[PDB]
Design a protein around this ligand. Structure first.
Ligand code: SAH
Ligand code: ZN
Length: 1064
């Protein structure tokens, strides 16, 4: 007879989304523990048991027991294997109404059968077979349990049908339709609940029909083998998706070696246990207090003489008495808010005067509570911040005078002990006043600027002047004067947004004002136009003549041409003044500057050709005339890099001229060798930062400020005398940068104590550098309900830093990858906090925002999707000149065969003749066939693979279409991008970070070659020059490239620090 198997599409609606198998321990193979298997009846084979088992196909995907025969077949087209811990046949059974000394850990051969035996009701047992023995099953692994539960549900349904076919007795009474009816009426709590719809019920029964069919053969009674239901289910079933195998009785024997996918595969590395971070006691206090609290008629007179006069002729005073209390300039007062439930508001006195008629009036600046800023619940109860907002009220509206001081404290590592003692004294005084219940004393140290996204230092000479003159009032008046169109003089020019436009200037015009990996396609850059005159239409319009870019002729001419080139024309437009975005410069080609930077950073173009729009021909500029091509012409800081990697941030910060990476701490051997290969004068420590900070504190005598574990103490005592003398002591470090792998969970505090952000912050606390830079993923601002970000800010503010936060997009600075990163800048009180770099490339990103509290947001830079100074950068611009390689090419040193054509390929190569690391990961045979059968078009993925059966060189028959996740219902979106190919005219996705060759491939194939992206190609999509060197095996090199901050973005950030270092 023929055995009908129901294909995976019919049974997929019940099983979870596909997932794959991983292990860390070595496994013996099955075939060596047993002798050779000659012709033997399947009755007489070893009987054993398995614990912590799983089942998987040749791609390592989790698979069901319903895809194996219930009986003995001859040929099987499905290759199923497994894992298990071998033990002895003891006799365990599973109870439906509801030990591992590692006998040995094995990986199994081709599974060819399974079986269910019926004990008592609610007690069954399940056994499986390979060609050497019989194996009985026990408790499954945690991750394969979701593929175990649907089998027992069908067991319950079958038991129920037996019960109410015999309970009703007259076994030959119920019919398929009758059973569907009685099943359908069950309540939604019984364990045999299929569905309340007849059609869904019959679907379930027919789809899972072989389990019921065997359970209706091993249930002891000669009353259920001829039932109408039994023969109905078998006569049905055919009208579903099915495969037809042959049932024959045979006599077993091995023929093949173990074709398990795990044969010859190394186990993956461990998940190294987190150890408690080495912190200082200040950081420990800050982070531990939070996690132990949280988530675990009256007279008035002027006092004294007059000081001067405001610029209206009105007297100006300094000290006033509000009924017994004293109010002074520099103090603070509390005003009674409308609703008598919230706390009062506190105002900083700027000046007080007597109005024209007669009044007692003051002008105040708003002092805000740290509870209502981005800090929130992490802020001190006594810390107030200064804002830009002002207020004028009468001196009768006060509730009372607050107690307030401005805290100016000295800076340096040399002062950090005296500070700690003074802080503890103040904390004790605060507790004493709270218990006796006296008033609160407040202090201010910083300035809150929600529109600049940071805490800045106090302008101490600007505040509290008592001269009738307020700085914030000037700033607001200027900001409202800035928003008017001001045609200068009678004519010839104007003012918009603070930019003066004159006649014969070159301007930027918005592209629309003049007329998948694909997101910049259809996105255009500014239109470069020349201003001719001013037309009446006082509100005016402007007359402009335009420039055509290489983009506007064809795509190939844009590939060939420099990115700062423009084509002349004779086209004129009349425009409204509000379409004008900025000013640029256009020179002749010979007048262009000699210095070339990869991030271009300046607004300069050149012209040499003509574009006749009527015929579409490029020709030399008409000698007839020329369009007046106007525009006629030590600070380096000693650096410590923590969590270094291969050096993406240090390369960009050393190129710009601010860093000299003298010390570095990377605990992995491959990344440390890669770092030392490229920065040969740097001292590299391949050690955990928890042991390095312990050694540094031990070298200064400060072993009592250290919170450390004893094993780290022993590791710090196991250092060579040579290594100890090359350590950074506090005093010699002026700049600290780092990429800590901060995480997200909840804690238990016990589970938060093991986080690497605490050790980084302790490095900042011990060394106290001039500048501090933190980089991390964009999700950092939303980990743990925003608590890690809030606590990081509060920790940096307890020391005395200025802090600034922002999210930046790398594609707007010159790369083909869309990497979003979060940056925190910290500077001493007496420095200048670096600005943010200007994005000059067009990218399709919607303006990344950080949520300040109380309904406000902040965004650091602009969005360039509607127009930017330069043209986007494509895949052909990045990898178009590299030679052709094949699957699994290991040759590290090759040669260049073509020359550069595009601007990017002339920046990246330079004067390099040796092509290193143009190697790719090897795909096995079945994945290679699928990669060769994918079309070379934009947006081609696994939906393009024909449904077919592939025969390999082993004799294995496999399936062309990989993961099966439709489950024909929502909970998936088609899984677009898996087994995907890139687009020549698009950009690199952020899924080529560590391409995987086996299970869930992703979008990593070459646009025309049948292979995965090479290491060199992934290095060029982040801006790494062709001379940069990597180290390790291929996996470590891909990891080193994936973790890095792009060197172009790091150059732009470091060039803004070099401007801040000149302004001091
Ligand atoms: N406890 C620890 N001590 C030192 N290094 C660690 C560490 N835990 C992780 N690391 C290393 O720190 C690095 C964090 S990635 C930092 C990336 C770096 N910005 C760059 O520019 O390339 C990883 O390479 C990791 O290997
Ligand atoms: Zn003011």
């Amino acid at each position: 007879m023929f055995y009908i198997k129901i294909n995976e599409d019919e049974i997929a609606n019940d099983y979870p989304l596909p997932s794959y198998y991983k292990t860390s321990e070595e496994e013996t193979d099955e075939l060596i523990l047993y002798d050779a298997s000659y012709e033997v009846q399947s009755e007489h084979l070893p009987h054993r048991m398995l614990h912590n088992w799983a089942l998987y196909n040749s791609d390592l995907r989790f698979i069901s027991l319903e895809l194996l025969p219930m009986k003995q077949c001859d040929d099987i087209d499905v290759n199923i294997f497994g894992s298990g811990v071998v033990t002895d046949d003891n006799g365990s059974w599973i109870s439906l109404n509801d030990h591992d000394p590692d006998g040995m850990c094995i990986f199994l051969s081709q599974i060819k059968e399974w079986m269910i035996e019926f004990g008592s009701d609610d007690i069954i047992s399940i056994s499986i077979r390979t060609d050497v023995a019989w194996y009985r099953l026990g408790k499954p692994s945690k991750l394969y349990a979701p593929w175990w539960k649907p089998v027992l549900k069908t067991a319950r349904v079958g038991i129920s049908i037996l019960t109410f076919l015999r309970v009703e007795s007259r076994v030959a009474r119920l019919s398929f339709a009758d059973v569907t009816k009685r099943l359908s009426g069950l309540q939604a709590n019984d364990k045999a609940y299929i569905s309340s719809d007849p059609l869904a019920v019959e679907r379930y029964l027919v789809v899972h029909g072989q389990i019921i069919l065997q359970l209706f053969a091993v249930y002891p009674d000669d009353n259920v083998k001829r039932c109408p239901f039994v023969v109905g289910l078998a006569s049905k079933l055919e009208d579903r998706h099915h495969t037809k195998w042959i049932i024959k009785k045979k006599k077993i024997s091995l023929k093949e070696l173990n074709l398990n996918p795990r044969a010859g595969m190394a186990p993956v590395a461990s998940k190294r246990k987190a150890m408690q971070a080495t912190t200082t006691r200040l950081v420990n206090r800050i982070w531990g207090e939070f996690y132990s609290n949280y988530s675990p008629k009256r007279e008035i007179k002027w006092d004294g003489e007059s000081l001067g006069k405001t610029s209206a002729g009105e007297p100006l005073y300094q000290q006033a008495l509000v009924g017994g209390e004293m109010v002074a300039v520099g103090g603070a007062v509390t005003l009674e808010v409308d609703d008598p439930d919230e706390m009062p508001a506190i105002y900083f006195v700027e000046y007080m005067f007597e109005s024209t008629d007669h009044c007692k009036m003051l002008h105040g600046r708003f002092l805000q509570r740290g509870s209502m800023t981005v800090l929130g619940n992490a802020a001190n109860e006594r810390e107030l911040f200064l804002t830009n907002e002002c207020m004028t009220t009468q001196l009768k509206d006060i509730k009372g005078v607050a107690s307030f001081e401005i805290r100016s404290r000295p800076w340096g590592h040399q002062y950090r002990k005296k500070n700690i003692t003074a802080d503890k004294l103040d904390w004790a005084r605060a507790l004493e006043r709270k218990v006796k219940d006296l008033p609160t004393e407040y202090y201010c140290k910083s300035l809150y600027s929600p529109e600049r996204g940071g805490f800045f230092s106090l302008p101490l000479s600007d505040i509290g002047r008592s001269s009738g003159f307020c700085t914030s009032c000037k700033i607001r008046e200027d900001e409202e004067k800035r928003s008017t169109i001001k045609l200068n003089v009678s004519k010839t020019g104007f003012f918009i947004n603070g930019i003066e436009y004159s006649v014969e200037d070159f301007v930027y015009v918005n592209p629309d004002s003049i007329g998948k990996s694909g997101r910049n396609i259809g996105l255009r850059a500014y239109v470069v136009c020349q201003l001719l005159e001013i037309v009446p239409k006082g509100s005016f319009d402007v007359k402009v003549r335009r420039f055509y870019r290489p983009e506007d002729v064809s795509a190939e001419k844009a590939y060939a041409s420099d990115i700062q080139e423009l084509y002349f024309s004779q086209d004129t437009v009349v425009l409204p003044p509000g379409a004008l975005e900025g000013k640029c410069e256009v020179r002749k080609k010979s007048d262009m500057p000699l210095s070339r930077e990869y991030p271009i950073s300046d607004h300069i173009f050149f012209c040499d050709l003509f574009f006749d729009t009527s015929k579409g021909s490029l020709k030399q500029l008409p000698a007839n005339m020329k369009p007046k091509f106007s525009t006629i012409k030590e600070i380096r800081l000693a650096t410590l890099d923590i969590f270094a990697g291969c050096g993406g941030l240090s390369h960009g910060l050393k190129k710009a001229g601010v860093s000299d990476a003298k010390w570095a701490i990377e605990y992995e051997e491959p990344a440390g060798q890669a770092f030392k290969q490229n920065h040969p004068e740097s001292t590299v420590f391949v050690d955990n930062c928890n042991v390095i900070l312990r050694a540094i504190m031990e070298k200064g005598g400060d072993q009592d400020d250290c919170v450390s574990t004893t094993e780290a103490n022993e590791l710090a005592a196991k250092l060579t005398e040579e290594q100890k003398s090359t350590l950074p002591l506090p005093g010699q470090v002026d700049f600290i940068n780092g990429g800590p792998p901060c995480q997200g969970f909840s804690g238990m505090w016990s589970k938060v104590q093991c986080e690497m952000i605490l050790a980084f912050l302790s490095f900042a606390d011990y060394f106290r550098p001039r500048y501090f830079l933190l980089e991390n993923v964009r999700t950092f601002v939303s980990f743990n309900k925003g608590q890690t970000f809030q606590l990081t800010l509060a920790s940096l503010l307890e020391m005395g830093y200025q802090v600034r936060f922002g999210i930046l997009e790398a594609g707007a600075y010159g790369v083909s990858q869309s990497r979003k990163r979060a940056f925190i800048w910290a500077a001493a009180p007496e420095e200048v906090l670096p600005e943010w770099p200007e994005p000059m490339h067009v990218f399709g990103v919607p303006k990344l925002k950080i949520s300040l509290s109380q309904g406000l947001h902040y965004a650091a830079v602009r969005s360039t999707a509607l127009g930017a100074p330069f043209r986007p950068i494509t895949v052909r611009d990045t990898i178009g000149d590299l030679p052709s390689v094949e699957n699994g090419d290991s040759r590290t040193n090759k040669e260049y065969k073509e020359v550069a054509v595009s601007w990017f390929q002339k920046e990246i190569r330079g004067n390099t003749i040796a092509l290193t690391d143009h190697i790719c990961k090897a795909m096995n045979e079945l994945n290679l066939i699928r990669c060769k059968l994918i079309p070379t078009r934009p947006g081609a993925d696994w939906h393009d693979l024909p449904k077919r059966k592939v025969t390999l060189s082993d004799g294995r028959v496999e399936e062309m279409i990989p993961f099966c996740l439709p489950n024909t219902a929502e909970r998936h979106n088609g899984w677009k991008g898996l087994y995907g190919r890139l687009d020549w005219q698009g950009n690199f996705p952020t899924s080529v970070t560590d391409p995987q060759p086996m299970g869930k491939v992703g979008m990593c194939f070459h646009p025309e070659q049948h292979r995965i992206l090479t290491v060199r190609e992934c290095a060029r999509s982040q801006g790494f020059p062709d001379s940069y060197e990597f180290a390790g095996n291929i996996n470590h090199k891909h990891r080193q490239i994936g973790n890095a901050v792009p060197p172009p973005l790091a150059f732009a950030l470091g060039r803004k620090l070099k401007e801040a270092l000149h302004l001091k």
